[model samples]
Structures are given as structure tokens and as C-alpha cells.
Target: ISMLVSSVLPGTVVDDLAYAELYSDPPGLVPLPEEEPLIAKSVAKRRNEFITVRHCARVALGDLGVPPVPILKGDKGQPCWPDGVVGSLTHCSGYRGAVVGRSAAVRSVGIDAEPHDVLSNGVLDAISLPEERDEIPSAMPDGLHWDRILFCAKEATYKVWFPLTNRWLGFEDAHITFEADDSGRTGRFVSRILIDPSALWGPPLTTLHGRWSVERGLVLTAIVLLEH
Candidate 1:
């Protein structure tokens, strides 16, 4: 969970509403049993988040027009999505459910959220690449939280690539080159899935399609794998 609250947003991309929908039991899907008192209480606390996610998914998949597709646990615990579909799920206390998906043509997608803050001490140093850290402020003369922000960005990137490849991408393996604009700050991520099963992935990493932004004390990043 890369909690970032200090990134930038791309100017009006797609209408947000285009991404929202309600999910009813479409078919072959079942909501968790609402029997246990404890379970019911927990659901009560997160009812809005649950329903909203269902809605967002429903909207993204309009034609399938059946009902809320059942969300089942997969082999590794990831949600087993409907056939020909790949998507991600996200929800915050106030942010609510925001999901993104596409047809099978797309390999996979990743999304993440982080609170606005610096990376933990040891955690930051472990994954901190020298060059990435070099770009940070020393102490007082110039002070910017580049270390924390970059870590968050890398984390977001890893989340996107991990599930698709079922591989681990270390922080050092990915580097982010940030660019500044009038609106705020944006980032370019270059990374290599060094632990992949195939031999095609080489050094210097592959260029990825990614976008990141910060708003309302949170950092949000999304990545979608392009069709080969």
C-alpha cells in the first residue's frame, strides 16, 4: 500500500462517471453470506464501499448487462474475474470503490493508494536507489520529500506488474524520472520484470504506460498493460 498524497493529476482524461456502475448479482456470483453478526456488522461499516465497487464494475461492463458478476476467490486469492475480463479494485474510507477494467486484449492492470507522508526509515533506505535518493533534498537548505514520493510510485508500479507476471519486482529494479509542469508534478516509470518466466525482458527495463497524481491527501497511480 503506497500511500501518496503529493503527486499530480493529468488534465481531464475520461469522464469519471463513465467509470462508475452498480453491480447486482449478475450470474454465477454470490454475495458473502450475511449471517454472522460480526460479519454483518463489518459489512455494515463498509456497505457503501462494497455496493460502490459493484456499481463501478457494472458501469464499465455495460453490454454484459446481466447482473453483478460474482466475485470469487482465485487460486492465489485474487478475485477471479469473469471470462475475457481483467480489472483492479480500490476503495478508501472517503474515496469509495473505483475500479478499472478492459477486455482480454489487455494483459493486466494495477492501481494503488498511499497517504501523504515520507517512507518509513529502514523501508525507505532498503529500496532507495542512489540516483533516486540523489534527487532528494539534503536536509534544511533544500527540503523536498523525493525519497518517500518515489518509493510510493515504485510501489504502485510493482502492484500493476506483479499479478500479471506472478513475479516480484524489487524497488531497485524500477526507477522513476519525475517531470514538473504548471499543474503540478508527473512521473515516468522505467522498470524491468527481472524475475519473469520468459527471456524477452532485458536490462534497462521496459517502458511502461502509467499515470500518477496526488489529491486530497492521498497518492493514486494506475497502470494498464498494453496488448502485445
Candidate 2:
């Protein structure tokens, strides 16, 4: 996970940034006291994913010198990081992880992981527009799952968008264009804001940028917005 994630880190480029990650789920973990309630009444699956990822969040936070604290959910179901932090959490079968950055360096961060597979029935159309469905086939190389790649890109876009706007960015609100150099394994994506009032968002929010890679049977995407 770190290898794929590190590739996309803005900090790794000429761009300036600082961030940290807990690459995989850890063992013998327990949720912080205030963090336990959200999953207390849930079944085993929810409990396991929730607790394991939060543990990663805690350790990732520590790497930046932040102390452990209950990470509650935001009003809209996002994780609420401590006052000085900004980050994202991701979970998938057999993997769970957190990537965090100090608020001083990163304005926002979003990361997502999906198995390297096609989208389930009816989902591709629902998430992407008809033109997008038609264009992506030739836009991306044959080795990649076109539908899943589009879906993951939007998912990563929303992760950074929502926190900055305090509003929703439907899958249809942005049009995606993918460029991969990977033997089909690595690439960068751009999302053009397709909704109205684009003027209200400064130049930065008018478009979004992200990087993606497929490795270890997972399709992962990440977006990092720096504080300039």
C-alpha cells in the first residue's frame, strides 16, 4: 500500500507537502473509548473494519506528533480528525489503512481503494453519464477495468471536494479524463467541474487532479490538496 500511495504523494514531487500512513490493518487493536460507540451495536463485519482502520488512523496521526483521540464522524458521515489534522481512511476486503497530514501542510487529502474488478450490475451507468461510458473505453487502455477506474476516480474526487465545499459532488457533477502510462498500472486523472457556480470556487476548485495505480489486486486513487 505504501509503495502505491507513495507514488502519488505530492510531497514526493517538486510540490511541497508532509504526510504519513499506516499501510495495513494491525492486530490486537481496540478502539479508543469514545470511538467504540459507533460500532458497538453493529455486526462483526462493521466492527472489524471500523476498529482496524481507526487503529491505523491513530498510528498515522502519531507519526506526525499528534496524540491519540477519539475520531468521531462528521455530520455527513466523514471521519472528523482532530483540530490540527486532515486526512482520509480507506477499507476494503483484506486491507484497511489511513493517510494523514498536518493541517499546516495539507489543506485536504483523500484516498480510496477498490478491488481490481468491474463495477457491479447497473452501477457503472448510474455513476457515469452515457457519453463518459462511451468515451472511456478508448480513453483508457484495454488492460484496465474502465468502469471501476471511473468510479474510483470520482470517489477520490469527492473525498477532497466535500470537505472543502461542505456540499455534495454527485458522480455526475464532474467529467473524468484518464491518462495511463502503466502497462496499464499507473496514471493521472482530471475531473472538470460540470456543475454550475463554478465561478464561486476559486481557480483551484474549478478542476481536480488525482493519481491512480493498480497493484496487489487493488485499484487505488489519491488526491492531495496543499495549503499554499
Candidate 3:
């Protein structure tokens, strides 16, 4: 899984990023001080998921030679990394993972994973545009969930957007194009930002590239931005 994740990100940014994952529920995992209140009202299952993913973030931070700190939640509900650090975390049914990098080397990153299941009825219509929905074929391979992948792509895009702007990014804010890979089961995608990003961040970003894969019953998506 590590190799697969690394394969998608740019080589220029890979060395500076620390990636971590756990296939099964991590044992003896602990959350940081700031994470306590965020998960206080969550159920047992949600708590376990939160703890494991944060643990992954800490491990990645340790790999980057940064001291472990509470990765708090921002006003927008995004993970707040330590100063000078940028990262993303994701958790699925049986998988939890995170990737972290220094701000000097990486501007921002977003990673997400979802079970390879079709979107619950009507969810596809709720989030996708008409043209976006027109592109998907009526039939797909057994494990392929194109709707879910599109959803994940938009999710990852927002994750990348909020940290830069500290503002809300709606599902319709960006347009995504999914390019088919040779295998037809997995592929890469690029998102075109429809809104201006210059208000808060430096210059406006025109596009964000990412990769998607369907394997082991999970659909994973990731995006990375390098320092300009």
C-alpha cells in the first residue's frame, strides 16, 4: 500500500513526505490533547477510527523529525497540523492512513479512502454535475464504484482547498476530469479550481492533480502540492 500511494505523488515531493498506514485496528493507540474534545461525543467505533488515524499522523510526524503534538481540528473541521507542517488523514472500514510533510517541501496534501461501494441511492445526483454524471457508463466492473470515486475526488479537492483558503469549498466549487488508466479499473484525475484562491493563499491555483485506485475493496484518492 505504501508503494502504491507513493507511486501516485510526484517524485519531487515524495522524499519530503512521510506516509503511514494500519490495515487492522491499531492497538494501544492514543489521541493527542487537542483531539479529545473533537471525538468526545463520537461513538466507540468513531472513536477508534479517530484515534487510529491520528496515531498514523503522529507516526508520520515522528518520521519527519517533528515532535509529536496534538493534531487539532480547525474551524472548518480540517486536521490542524503543527506549525510548519501540512498533512492529510483518512480512515475506512478496515484501513486508516495519513501522510505528512514539511511546509517548505509541500504546500498542502489531501488523502481519502472509501469502501468500494456504490453511493447510497440518490447520492450520485446530489453531488455530481450533469456532465459529470453523463460520463459514467451505466455498467461497471464488479468492484468498481465510479460514483464513489468521483465523490472521493471532490472530497480530496476540498481537503486541499480549505487549508489554503480557510474557507468553505462546496462540492460544486471544482470541476473534475477522470482519465482512464490502461487497466480501466484505476486511473488518475485532475481538478480544475473554479474559484479564486488568491484572497488568502499566494496566487490562485488553476488545477490540482490526483490519483485513484480500486483495490482490496477500497477506493483511495490523493493529491499533493509542492512549494512554489
Using TM-score as the measure, the top candidate is: 3
Give the RMSD in angstroms, all C-alphas superposed, for model 1: 6.9
* Clash counts for all predictions: 17, 0, 0
Candidate 1 runs further than 4 Å off: 1-18, 21-55, 62-66, 136-145, 185-187, 192-205
User: What is the alpha-carbon lDDT for the whole of candidate 2?
Assistant: 0.77
User: Where is model 1 poorest over a 10-residue stretch in terms of lDDT?
Assistant: 9-18
RMSD of each: 6.9, 2.5, 2.3
lDDT of 3: 0.81
Q: What is the lDDT of residue 148 in candidate 1?
A: 55
Between the candidate structures 1 and 3, which one is better when assessed by TM-score?
3
Give all TM-scores, in the order shown.
0.65, 0.89, 0.90
Q: Candidate 3 on 124-194: residue-level lDDT in tens?
A: 87778787777655333444778998898889888887788777777777778887676866777888877
Q: Relative to the true structure, how large is the alpha-carbon lDDT of every model?
A: 0.51, 0.77, 0.81
Question: Regarding lDDT, does 1 or 3 come out ahead?
Answer: 3
Model 1 C-alpha lDDT per residue in residues 1-228, reported as the tens digit of each score = 332321322233222212432222234322444312223455544554555555555555563343455555456545556776666655553453334444434555555555556667788879777766665443112223555556666766776665556566788776666543345544544444434434134222265556666555655666666445
RMSD of 2: 2.5
